[PDB]
Subunit: 333 residues, 4 copies
């Protein structure tokens, strides 16, 4: 006597189903929604859950995505301040907290976002004990460490976005120089996300041609190709976008969807994301820095061993000391 | 001597090139940027141009998109306040609009958007004489008429977003009720975008099964399936999203990229978009209302003829009267 | 130290993994390989298993797909005459058997397939007890019933290709007549695959406009648009392709990949596939005929009830009698 | 009143539109149809034209693809023995092959193809004066020269498949040793397609880590990883597939669709295809060999300069001498 009962005859008994490829995005700000629309555009989720503390914005974002359902392949979009909505996620993307603000210190940003992660991370693993967490919130290397400690997950299931976007920006800047697609330019930005990153000059190449062999002054102060400036522009181009539009979100959203594609399609592609690097390159503390990592359906299963130069190792160790000096004073992790 | 000279040997001489599939988005607000990221995600553009009056925000958006180039298939992303940047676009998406002032009247807000269009639309056609224009800006049926008048373009090359999003919402809400994908739920919202739209109950079907034959009280006040309430929610769900997050953008972005895909791939798919309906359903003035329209590489080349019911025709005629009453009082078109 | 040992440092311990979306194709003939290339081009499989009795052809097909891996997103392609290679498949596509030289179907021909399927189907469920089976082998409605009986699976997990391809050909022919994309042409070919199929004229529509309402003579000899001839061409166009190239494969490959996409993305999209229709439209025997069915991650979970005409119901009953006449004399089920 | 006249009201007058991204495949054999299905699956063509000398098989392949139209985004699929069908193609794929007689000199086999190509190639350029020609037919380096000479086209519009598939198989074999996606493996097979190709060991890398740096014996007769055997497997794996299934087609079809994607999307990606290499690496004759080439909408616009070792340059020069030894004796070019 219901329309649905006149129209639809069951062949299977209706039952509780669990999604096969559920993704949660925590924080529905600029970055969380760029992540959400990128995941939906690539059809990466059979179920998308959104969480924030702003219950009205959260409901509005959920409804706006639902209204686009005809154009997508995600049959369930749900949102709630309550983490019960996130249950049985395969991947949880954490974009929550506050951006850096002009006039505020790096310590200040650590205190604001560690406060947020202390509430969020235990809730995530309560409902999705088997998930992979992708940490995007800044400062990303500290917050990846904080996530690993609070989550109790194994290292291979806690991934910092780290230098993934730095590398994508570097390959774009190379591409601009040469007039070719960034996918045909190869080069790795590793270590700490942003100011103190390492450009691995020996690896920079097109079609396997070492650009450091063609220009041995690459990365020195006596270089007519000014590669040191290109490395600086990886950092400075982001600050410029932040000054101009207030934040960055589109490139980070696409880069997060690209990580998720590698994992849910079980591809074992190599990405410069952040992993726990104690015992690598002489690092003696528990810190997360970016190295070329293999990603697949298990998470971050392997790292590439590189022949890093003494100056490259020296920067990784100084980064590890800077991170550890902040981390050793964090309480209740 | 330059790295590029050492690395790259020309086979062809460098030459002045014209993009084959250039798209321009006018307005880099939350709607324009949802259009841009949806266009880029579907690889619909070999060149994307952005235009706005906010020079810094425009540059920041352009740079953020460029930083994501590794993940895309759009070799040229450009932005400027000067419409020369839009030259040789195949498709121009207009999302430009002003912010309401505190307590500003409703016909005043219309006149201010019309004054924006009096500058923008002649510039668009100056630089892209061969383009198709998609109008998204509100009020969308009026601003589609304005664009048509100011552009001097034939009616097959000016397309209002109209009820494209209203029909996507309808198919979502009917899909939610039935537990099926919205692509398997068929139903048309026509006429005026928003409050005065027409739900064509007689066409609402699943697998060619008329839901109105199953439930003959569909659309009436004596209906246990409350279909009139579903039509109400098509209108009200949009106001609710605006109340909750301040605006809508994700669904409109996806719907616009769906229209562009029909045109650039020359598919002749049918979409409920706004066209110039003088001479249809007893309408005797130049107004734009939504009907099922065939879209391909020439633009909007055909409309589907419906036998509409008396109440459905009455509402289209009342809508045409409302739009013409506003239009006949606009100057310098 | 192997290359792998110098180059790749483990983060996670090495472990076997169960694929999340493994597909098996049984039979690497023209149809089997069209299904495989369509499955791989849509990235629907994280593991693809191929089975055949021709060991050299099987290994050759496996290697040729593997050589294309750079261009795909399927990290494991395996092939063996032994069904152990098929373990833990979500979906198994059965294309094995004999194909028509021109076209027929009779008790003895089906007993030869039952002889083939009697070995294949128990092997499939032995290694993938939780799979969904898509039957493509002709005669497809009888062999869907045979697969169901031999498998012991519930009816929601055994799906016949049925009239999925017939309906696609119908929508192509409608599109050629009207000059619109087939996705904008709606029409359902139901019942038996091939000669005795039913064209549900009542459901044929563009944009919800009933073409039978514009032409109430549609499907009779009272008809100047000769829609009866379009239905004839759905049947004959297949025989014509077999005449001209020896077999058909591309359209069936694409249509099978479309069914798989609905199920692995859990979409609940509606397709005209073959299901067990005992107790529908007065059918009294266990036979498989095509109706509009909902497909998702559970398999075929529902059927759409339609307001079918007396002559359409007579045809389903006669088809049922025809299939039951054959099945009742099959042995070793 | 035709059905179409009652249903569809023109907004623009009906007009003949020149397709924007038309592709022609010459030869509808195993390789041609692999190219066609990959082109269609990636939505690269608004019009696909097929040409062959076998009228029935050509028409059958055309009809089978048309019957899959619902599942594609190519609104026009055409086929004819007459090259008029190919008019206004952006790209033409040549897979047309005569088979070598079992007591036949290599000069005779190529002259047999020249007698065929002497009709095909002029006919292609007559109907598509602006086209890019991709030559797939074996022997591929000689036939690319023949195509260039007969076409009158500049070097940048004639592309030999060359070592494109050799490099894809090399990356697959690297990837199988490491358990990673072939896209994360980098290595270049250059020069002559097949037995005499050059593996550029100095460019073989993962994440910019030189495998020759890790193993300086890479490619020598004192090599514990036996990379010489991996290079042999690149050649031999193809002969193995021919022995096992009669031919290769799937990997070649995916590789051609990837080249087409670079050019139609104007990406300037680098591919190891065959270009006219007179005046490079001391080569003094008009021959085609594979180098890393930049592909975009103009065709092959640029080549990457490598620092090749003396033994690599000597092999390029030898290959050039072998090709020129045959070409100098060809008549009617
Ligand atoms: N790793 C990288 O490469 C990049 C990192 N980011 C970082 O991503 C983060 C997000 O940036 P935006 O989205 O622009 O910020 P935003 O201010 O637009 O969004 C942050 C959201 O987090 C929510 N939030 C705050 N506390 C929360 C809690 N306890 N639980 C749940 N949600 C909570 C807020 O309500 C807000 O909606 C920042 O830390 C930013 O620095 C941004 C760009 C790139
Ligand atoms: N038709 C539909 O279904 C929908 C229509 N819309 C409409 O889309 C429009 C855009 O909305 P939002 O992005 O949220 O607004 P917004 O105010 O955030 O962005 C509009 C942009 O237009 C720019 N603009 C103003 N004057 C300009 C000029 N002369 N040239 C170029 N750009 C100029 C502004 O600087 C601003 O960046 C509005 O009219 C909105 O109502 C909104 C959603 C759905
Ligand atoms: N349902 C539909 O809409 C369509 C159905 N078909 C049917 O698909 C089937 C396959 O046709 P084609 O691929 O053209 O035939 P084919 O002869 O090219 O391939 C059949 C393959 O099955 C293999 N095979 C036979 N017995 C086997 C066994 N016991 N175990 C494993 N493999 C076995 C053969 O060795 C061969 O490789 C036929 O029954 C054909 O009529 C084809 C077109 C459309
Ligand atoms: N470069 C590479 O890496 C690869 C190249 N190939 C080559 O591709 C070619 C095609 O191989 P298959 O498709 O397996 O052969 P096939 O024999 O299956 O198909 C060849 C087709 O060309 C047609 N043809 C012959 N002469 C013609 C003419 N004058 N005009 C038009 N069509 C004509 C034939 O009728 C036939 O349909 C061969 O030369 C083969 O060696 C094969 C795979 C890899």
């Amino acid at each position: 006597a219901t329309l649905k009962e006149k129209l639809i005859a069951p062949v299977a008994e209706e039952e509780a189903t669990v999604p096969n490829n559920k993704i949660t995005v925590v924080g529905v700000g600029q970055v969380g929604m760029a992540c959400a629309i990128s995941i939906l555009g690539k059809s990466l989720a059979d179920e998308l859950a959104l969480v924030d503390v702003l219950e009205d914005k959260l409901k509005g974002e959920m409804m706006d995505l639902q209204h686009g359902s005809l154009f997508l392949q995600t049959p369930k979009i749900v949102a709630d301040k309550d983490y019960s909505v996130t249950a049985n996620s395969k991947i949880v993307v954490v974009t929550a907290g506050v951006r850096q603000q002009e006039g505020e210190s790096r310590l200040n940003l650590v205190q604001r976002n560690v406060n947020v992660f202390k509430f969020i991370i235990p809730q995530i693993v309560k409902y999705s004990p088997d998930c992979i967490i992708i940490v995007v919130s800044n400062p990303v290397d500290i917050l990846t460490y904080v996530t690993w400690k609070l989550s109790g997950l194994p290292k291979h299931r806690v991934i910092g976005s780290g230098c993934n976007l730095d590398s994508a920006r570097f390959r774009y800047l190379m591409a601009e120089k040469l007039g070719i697609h960034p996918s045909s330019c190869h080069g790795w930005i590793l270590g700490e996300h942003g100011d103190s990153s390492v450009a691995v000059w020996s690896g920079v190449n097109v079609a396997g041609v070492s650009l450091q062999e063609l220009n041995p002054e690459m990365g020195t102060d006596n270089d007519s190709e000014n590669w040191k400036e290109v490395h600086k522009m990886v950092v400075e181009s982001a600050y410029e976008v932040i000054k101009l539009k207030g934040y960055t979100n589109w490139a980070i959203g696409l880069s997060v969807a690209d990580l998720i594609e590698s994992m849910l399609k079980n591809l074992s592609r190599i990405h410069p994301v952040s992993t726990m690097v104690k015992g690598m390159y002489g690092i003696e503390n528990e810190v997360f820095l970016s190295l070329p990592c293999i990603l697949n359906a298990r998470g971050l299963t392997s790292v590439i061993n590189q022949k890093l130069k003494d100056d490259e190792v020296a920067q990784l160790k100084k980064s590890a000391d800077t991170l550890w000096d902040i981390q050793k004073d964090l309480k209740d992790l």
